[PDB]
Amino acid sequence: PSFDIVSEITLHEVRNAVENANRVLSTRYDFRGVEAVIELNEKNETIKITTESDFQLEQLIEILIGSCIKRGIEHSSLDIPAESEHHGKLYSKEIKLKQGIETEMAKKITKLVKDSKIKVQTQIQGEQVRVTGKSRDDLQAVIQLVKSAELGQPFQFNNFRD
Ligand code: MMC
Ligand SMILES: [Hg+2]
């Protein structure tokens, strides 16, 4: 048998979170008279945040995170750069939506499996990790293992095949 490890982001839920975050943002006493933009590029899978200083960026980030929590979206699905791009008077950050599993994260998954000694095979393909084993009880252990760890982005488990 097998199962797929996946990392999917429901954009629908994300657009919802960004709307909430713009409503909070428009009532912020400390942002009155201050440029501050929180936009979603649904085609690019990016959330662009722009304001007048790195501090204020941090402040926008807390809003964002504060909106995922309200929408029960896991914040770690956001890939937020450490540095800001400074343009004239403005500073911004392109925040990436973690849609799927890139090789780097897949290798952290595959590595964890090797280390757990569970007798299952891993195939890094597409944007997922397929876990194949003789034993369903082992496959379940794998699920608990990956759930327990903090590799860095949320995972889902589907396509259980016999
Ligand atoms: C974005 Hg929350
Ligand atoms: Hg989010």
We report the CATH number of the domain holding residue 53 as 3.30.70.990
Beta bridge partners of 126: none
CATH number at residue 153: 3.30.70.860
Residue 113 Cβ contacting ligand 1 at under 6 Å:
no
Task: Give, in order, the Cα–Cα distances in Å from 63 to each of 8, 15, 48.
Answer: 22, 14, 13
Same domain, 73 and 141: no
Same domain, 86 and 18: yes
CA distance 122 to 114: 9
Burial of 12 (0-12, 13-18, 19+ CB in 10 A): exposed
Same domain, 87 and 115: no
Q: Which of 34, 26, 32 is nearest to 90 (CA)?
A: 34
Order of strands, sheet of 156-161, starting from the edge strand that comes earlier in the sequence: 120-125, 128-133, 2-6, 156-161
Resolution of the coordinates in A?
A: 2.1
Q: State the virtual CA torsion across 44, 47, 53, 59 in degrees, nearest 10.
A: -170
If you measure from the C-alpha of residue 90 to the centroid of ligand 1, how many angstroms do you get, rounded to a whole number?
21
Reading phi first (left if > 0) and then psi (alpha if -120 to 50, else beta), residue 88 is in left
Tokens of 161: 């095949």
Same domain, 117 and 43: no
Total number of domains in the chain: 2
Residue 106 Cβ contacting ligand 1 at under 6 Å:
no
Q: Could you tell me which residues come within 8 angstroms of residue 54 by beta carbon, excluding any fewer than 6 positions away?
A: 84, 91
Same domain, 112 and 40: no
Same domain, 69 and 137: no
Same domain, 92 and 138: no
Task: Give, in order, the Cα–Cα distances in Å from 9 to each of 13, 65, 94, 96, 160.
Answer: 8, 15, 17, 11, 20
> Roughly what angle, to the nearest 10 degrees, separates helices 103-116 and 136-148?
120
Residue 73 Cβ contacting ligand 1 at under 6 Å:
yes
Closest atom of ligand 1 to 18 CA is 1
Q: Do 150 and 161 meet the contact criterion of CB atoms below 8 Å apart?
A: no
Burial of 113 (0-12, 13-18, 19+ CB in 10 A): buried
Closest atom of ligand 1 to 71 CA is 2
Same domain, 91 and 26: yes
CA distance 89 to 84: 12
Beta bridge partners of 107: none
- Domain membership of residue 123 as a residue range: 1-7+100-162
Tokens of 74: 């896991």
